[model samples]
Target chain A: QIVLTQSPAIMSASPGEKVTITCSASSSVSNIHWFQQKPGTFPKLWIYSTSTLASGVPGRFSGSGSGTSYSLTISRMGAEDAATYYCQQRSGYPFTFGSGTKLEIKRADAAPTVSIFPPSSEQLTSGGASVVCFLNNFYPKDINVKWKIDGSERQNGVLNSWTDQDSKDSTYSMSSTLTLTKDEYERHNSYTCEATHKTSTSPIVKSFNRNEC
Target chain B: EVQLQQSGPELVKPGASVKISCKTSGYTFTKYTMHWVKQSHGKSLEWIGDINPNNGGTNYNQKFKGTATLTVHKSSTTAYMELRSLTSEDSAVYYCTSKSFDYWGQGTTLTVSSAKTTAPSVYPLAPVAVTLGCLVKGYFPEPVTLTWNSSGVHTFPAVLQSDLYTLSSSVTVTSSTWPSQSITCNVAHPASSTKVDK
Candidate 1:
């Protein structure tokens, strides 16, 4: 059995808006099944075949299309409706899922909230440590998150950004981290995060003391 | 109303064996699949295989094919799993999952040590803040592999922070990933396959 692929893997909208996501299969399929995942929870079967809604699902959620193409549409997106949507196929064996469409709603005109999560003492005592500067409740996905050690920049670790509608909070979040030797981390005067967003004039800066973490 | 209540914890010897049971309720037991999951040291989940409770048919992970056996009791609406040749490596918690893995049962703890430790519990999300991503968490002593459907192995992006032992950062989804709307994160460990869906 071949796997299905989803387009626009991520999307954004506001409550009461209409949003549609499409799924494509490797070969022609007679029908498709849809699933919804809220963060920190298991997935709920949202739609079966192309149109039948799963038990307990609201009427606003609907699906359409057939063959190698299919779509899951939310006629009216609610604030709590934000979630990662998924498409799959029982048309054949070895069922599969799309990479997922992480969905978020625009929460009015909110600026981002920034904080830092320093590595644990164990992570600190080890050879190296990672520092995360978190930007939460942000709007407009085009924000920049940067990391620096004592004002010097580096990119040795990874960044994770997403919105968990399941979290019941429609705000978006991003985290950037810097991983380096423990000696350097403790010796450094400061670790800084400079977040730049279109909605704000000055970049939002959050910092951490090397010795504290 | 689907419910799966598993049995209590077990402390067996290294060379011994144990059989665990899952008593299901609320739904037609035979109509769905009863899958078994093994979690070692509170780490990642492993799909041991599944049983067609309706029929005697079964599918198993290649590694667990000989180590684990699946059986069912239709009259009692119960499913049973037998783990043979137990060892410290087999010391872990097991769960009876159904609804295509959307539902999970309180796990059955299996400790291979001669003495028993305090029994713990087990349990069972999605989207957005956009850019499809999988956040894998749980304390694990073994290797954990996380994959997105059809998108291949995802390396953490510039904004998410994660490591293999404890947690994961987010994976962004692009337009190139479209056409297939199914988003799944299969968290596989060395013990077996975790076939749960998005």
Candidate 2:
């Protein structure tokens, strides 16, 4: 079993626009598993590769499967997409999640918003020495984040920034140079990053580590 | 860009441990990281935690609460996680996870039959933001795993959320990790294995 990949959740406001949420299974996982979840509520398993509903679900939700590609389509953007749209799979264990897509109505008559924060990437290498982590689609203030080693905190030494014109989301990427003796690096070696957003829901905390050969 | 190809399905007895590995192909020996995840018996998911590539670092889900240890070999693009202190409740299929663990291993199952301990706490995510430890020995022995769990249960629930479902523990840590407590996921497996980031 492998992780399932997915398109970032989309947001829009136009009445009749089609909201498509896509998730790709790592392997040919029956080309299956789909669930619709609303805030604070348990998930509603809608379309399986068989396009079958899980027991008692409304008919408004449907799925179409084509090979390893599967899609969950809600004909019309209902009040639902307003919540976080998570494409998940039970195809394998530790149910993998595509970074949740947040779909919402911008305002009274604005386009529905579809925002995808960049996938989180960090350093992983031999001796796992010098490292960098990347996260895109954050904006506004001069963006910054702190890096943590194992469970302890580290001071900020390096930082970078960028933005996506398509979505107008800015990103702040940073790198932390481990200042440790080879032995020290070998001892307490796991690394983590936590990015707090002046904007967005929930903080993004990412981690990576190096161990003995 | 070495890849991780894991071995499939494993059977273990209670009070014992199981370890899985992933063999690498592309990239240089010690360049990338490897992660560990656990899927329950008869389930399709994983509990994701720290990377262990011998850089001397490890991560864990507070939920794994002391049951998994993630390690790796630098010469090959391989990573391994050991599940220790096995029990009937701990019976579940586990997998090596990848970036964000959105990817996974084919999977292996560890079944604890001789029911040694009652059960331990259940963790959700490797201690992403907190530093946590595992509290075992309601009257047991030997070295156990160290991890984080929201609800400290005694046994690894065979049925989670519902009847027999597996889950990878998770935590959203800040740039600063919590202090003191344990921060890891490891179970005992006789040997070592490697995994991919997918």
Candidate 3:
């Protein structure tokens, strides 16, 4: 399969600024398409077959390129355009998409506050135990959450909630839960929840232990 | 009220085959074609192929011709894609879209097990220009993110070797800033859920 590399995975620009996102393919391609996606919504096809704009797409948005190189440009950035843009190619089998570029209207400086809540004594004694991680007050609405046991990642019983934005502060919040059976809970030494945000230089990690409960 | 309900997530061993289903309702199933798309964890989407439910006719992307098989059960108004010879590369979320791309099914995640992700190894290739290369190998579920302190980076596609996936990323720094700058390569793989920096 061919790989498509997207430049400037994330960026911020004020209103009226011209923004251009580039996608380079591993090999030559006939045409590339573009999609725009907002938080909590499905992706919308904006450009197709290279430069052809899809119906209902704004006139400010344009796509151009050929062979191994392509670009999606916004003539003027607007508040409504503060979302992620992805480029796709259908010229070959197993057609691919760009990694995506997140555009921010007004970048925020807030970083997420992360905390982990372990199962209560009553819940732990009952049957399966669960740990919940709460992350709040982050901007851009893009975050990654991971659960680990003794430094090793676990995905089987992990569930991440949909991110919600607080209109008052324009920050985002979400929760993640890690469930473990009685035997599995006791076999592990430590449980950790890690949160990665665009604003943070390093991941915010919190750990919980059985003894803590 | 058109609705497309997809099958649940799948967890299968490497080399094992699995088929996922997409059932449609509130619309005439045979009137539209179904397009299948794949999305690796935290990455963009890929169009695997498409099939017409009316006559059971199909068109496959050349890359997936041998790797995926698309079929339909018109009686139940359901579409299916059976992936064969599974590997880390096949681990992704698959979705079926309506003919006009108006309606889409919730994605079905396919996770291939039995393979472990290896930490990336960093190699400094040149002294004058300060070129750095990061190699990540033996990883399942093909998607990975490689960042260098982290921009102006070039990452290649993952290649299969001995049934495992390997990827290489490189970055070049000017000699003037080589000493003062802290050059770090970060590798993020969904299989591990941990970021490795070197």
**What are the per-model DockQ values?**
0.08, 0.05, 0.12
Give the clash total for candidate 2: 95
Clashing pairs in 3: none
lDDT string, candidate 1, A86-146, tens digits: 7867566445566578777766666776656565555565566666555665666678877
How many angstroms is residue A204 displaced in model 1 relative to the true structure, after the best TM-score fit?
2.0
- Candidate 3: where are CA atoms >4 Å away? A1-3, A14-17, A25-30, A38-42, A66-68, A76-80, A111-119, A123-135, A139-213, B1-3, B13-16, B25-33, B62-67, B85-89, B100-103, B112-198
In each prediction, how many residue pairs overlap at the backbone (N, C-alpha, C within less than 3 A)?
31, 95, 0
TM-scores, each model vs. reference: 0.57, 0.31, 0.55
Comparing candidate 1 with candidate 3, which one achieves the higher lDDT? 3
- Weakest 10 consecutive residues, lDDT, candidate 3 chain B? B119-128
i-RMSD per candidate, Å: 12.6, 19.8, 18.3
Q: Per TM-score, what order, best first?
A: 1, 3, 2
Writing each residue's lDDT as its tens digit, candidate 3 over B1-198 gives: 788899976767889999999999999999999998887666467788889996989988787889889999998999999998999778877889885555778778787877554443322222215555454545655556777763434455565554455565556567788668767667775465545444
**How big is the positional error of residue B4 in model 3, measured in Å on the Cα after superposition?**
3.4
Find the candidate with the highest lDDT and give its number: 3
* Candidate 1 vs 3: which has more TM-score: 1
lDDT at residue B30 of model 1 (Cα atoms): 85
| Model 3 lDDT per residue over A33-120, tens place | 7888775355677788778888788899988988999998999987777788888777776667789998776556677666566554
